[PDB]
Design a protein around this ligand. Structure first.
Ligand SMILES: Nc1nc2c(ncn2[C@@H]2O[C@H](COP(=O)(O)OP(=O)(O)NP(=O)(O)O)[C@@H](O)[C@H]2O)c(=O)[nH]1
Ligand SMILES: [Mg+2]
Ligand SMILES: [Mg+2]
Ligand SMILES: [Mg+2]
Ligand SMILES: [Mg+2]
Ligand SMILES: [Mg+2]
Ligand SMILES: [Mg+2]
Ligand SMILES: [Mg+2]
Ligand SMILES: [Mg+2]
Ligand SMILES: [Mg+2]
Ligand SMILES: [Mg+2]
Ligand SMILES: [Mg+2]
Ligand SMILES: [Mg+2]
Ligand SMILES: [Mg+2]
Ligand SMILES: [Mg+2]
Ligand SMILES: [Mg+2]
Ligand SMILES: [Mg+2]
Ligand SMILES: [Mg+2]
Ligand SMILES: [Mg+2]
Length: 450
RNA sequence: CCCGGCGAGGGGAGUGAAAAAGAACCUGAAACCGUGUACGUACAAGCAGUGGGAGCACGCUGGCGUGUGACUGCGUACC
């Protein structure tokens, strides 16, 4: 949670006019102690913050002379170029065959990441995927891959602990070339970088498969040893890329920076939940912005994921509002669809303009509130949903009693639907550019918060 | 919380000693306007009361108060 420390830091800087180099210094020190609190590659903390120090001395901006915009912009863009220079769109280069391996320390997230890639590339590539587990060591690891593969709808190549990993992956590659697959995901056992028999074993594995891609998997909570791990794995194995996992934790995962300092290999993907859908393309703009608290890249990516899962359902709510007008039917459809894409952190990060006025500790529980709405509007007869104005006291007693909640809550939800009804009408009558530009941010006077 | 137009206003709830203290806010008079009950009034002439007076209603403990006042004597405001 750098944003607590980095917020006091870079926000402190963004206050003071024509800042002395001393609070510049102190702020750098707090970024250092902040990344030190994040257990990111402590020597690489020192290096990074020395770089930020040298960069932050002589900048001038006519737009706004504020040095805090300079520290925020510098820390951002510098973490950006050090983390691979805005590589989101690029990802991995696809050839008609592709063979990718997942390697790294015990428990970093390799098996999970393999299935995430499977799902993601299954969606984007429109092609066929085969996966295989080279892990004969961890109990039930193969079964884990089989389960994940069955869940993501990806062909699974069987293997058991009684075999040799080389023979297994050789068989897998053979079957794959025979059955005309393209993307191949090979999940390997977790291993210490200082374990020679294992590292040799998978040097042999790589030698047998001849992969186009070797991906090192990093827990974002990985410590100072990262630079030592990445190098080791890059010296024997050598890796062509990096995946950074568990970024949904408060760990800042700048260890990958060390990993990208030694290796020089791009970081392709951000693991952002425990679910298969949780593979994101990595992007330094997104991780650095995510740290800083306000983001333009993650705003366009969460509005484009919301718009992708909600396209046919907002066109279903727009067709029913074209025929019967806006009802609790079109609203309820909006509710279930809205509950399926639901998350709060990907929503507040999309809007920096509203988060500048309100506390960043603001959270509505979407899983709670949304499903509550679905439930309450599941307690209405179809006439009350298509004709909401007839909902009365006894009706709200009935609705409140049906879902096992309070009448006040139902009042609140019908209030919400009232506001969204109005908004639907205002959107209907006015031109899109006028209705979007005429929205007012009200202060009861320019004096703030009152 | 409820009725209503996401109104006006209201009704519960809650604060308070008190909300017939609710911002159209201490006390809250008269004129003026009403809802409710008793009595009288649709063959009756006039400064509208006063003297007499039947009945009816309500209080009391067969009488005493209270309201009303059918019917008749006298009766043309104040400055
Ligand atoms: N929250 C979260 N959990 C993740 C992410 N990626 C992996 N995990 C989780 O981390 C745990 C370890 O993952 P696993 O795939 O077994 O890692 P592995 O590197 O294959 N382990 P091994 O070295 O034993 O083979 C699993 O619980 C899994 O669900 C992530 O991006 N976010
Ligand atoms: Mg594994
Ligand atoms: Mg009101
Ligand atoms: Mg009280
Ligand atoms: Mg008054
Ligand atoms: Mg007083
Ligand atoms: Mg008063
Ligand atoms: Mg009064
Ligand atoms: Mg009065
Ligand atoms: Mg006659
Ligand atoms: Mg008569
Ligand atoms: Mg007359
Ligand atoms: Mg008398
Ligand atoms: Mg009596
Ligand atoms: Mg008497
Ligand atoms: Mg009497
Ligand atoms: Mg008389
Ligand atoms: Mg006289
Ligand atoms: Mg006369």
């Amino acid at each position: 949670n750098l944003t607590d420390r980095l917020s006091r830091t870079l926000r402190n800087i963004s206050g003071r006019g024509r800042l002395t180099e001393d609070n510049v210094k102190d702020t750098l020190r707090e970024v250092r102690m902040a990344l030190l609190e994040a257990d990111v590659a402590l020597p690489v903390v020192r290096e990074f913050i020395n770089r930020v120090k040298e960069k932050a001395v002589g900048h001038e901006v006519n737009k706004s002379l504020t040095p805090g915009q300079e520290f925020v912009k510098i820390v951002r863009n510098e973490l950006v170029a050090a983390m691979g220079e805005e590589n989101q769109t690029l990802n991995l280069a696809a050839q008609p065959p592709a063979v990718v391996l997942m390697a790294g320390l015990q428990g970093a997230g390799k098996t999970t990441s393999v299935g995430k890639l499977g799902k993601f590339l299954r969606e984007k590539h429109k092609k066929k995927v085969l996966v295989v587990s080279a892990d004969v060591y961890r109990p039930a690891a193969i079964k884990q891959l089989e389960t994940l593969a069955e869940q993501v709808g990806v062909d699974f190549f069987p293997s058991d602990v009684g075999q040799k990993p080389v023979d297994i992956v050789n068989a897998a590659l053979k079957e794959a070339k025979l059955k005309f697959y393209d993307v191949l995901l090979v999940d390997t056992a977790g291993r210490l970088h200082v374990d020679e028999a294992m590292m040799d074993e998978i040097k042999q594995v790589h030698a047998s498969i001849n992969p186009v891609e070797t991906l090192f998997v990093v827990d974002a909570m990985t410590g100072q040893d990262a630079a030592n791990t990445a190098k080791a794995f890059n010296e024997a194995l050598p890796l062509t890329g990096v995946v950074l996992t568990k970024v949904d934790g408060d760990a800042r995962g700048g260890a990958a920076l060390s990993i990208r300092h030694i290796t020089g290999k791009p970081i392709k993907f951000l693991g952002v939940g425990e679910k298969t859908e949780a593979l994101e393309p990595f992007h330094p703009d997104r991780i650095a912005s995510r740290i800083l608290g306000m983001x333009x890249x993650x705003x366009x990516x969460x509005x484009x994921x919301x718009x992708x899962x909600x396209x046919x359902x907002x066109x279903x709510x727009x067709x029913x509002x074209x025929x019967x007008g806006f009802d609790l039917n079109d609203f309820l459809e909006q509710l279930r669809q809205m509950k399926n894409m639901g998350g709060x952190x990907x929503x507040x990060x999309x809007x920096x303009x509203x988060x500048x006025x309100x506390x960043x500790x603001x959270x509505x529980x979407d899983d709670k509130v949304l499903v509550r709405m679905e439930a309450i509007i599941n307690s209405m007869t179809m006439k009350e949903r298509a004709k909401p104005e007839i909902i009365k006291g006894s009706r709200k007693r009935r609705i409140a009693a049906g879902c096992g909640m309070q009448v006040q809550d139902v009042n609140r939800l019908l209030k919400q639907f009232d506001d969204m009804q109005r908004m639907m009408k205002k959107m209907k009558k006015g031109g899109x550019x006028x209705x979007x530009x005429x929205x007012x941010x009200x202060x009861x006077x320019x004096x703030x918060x009152x």
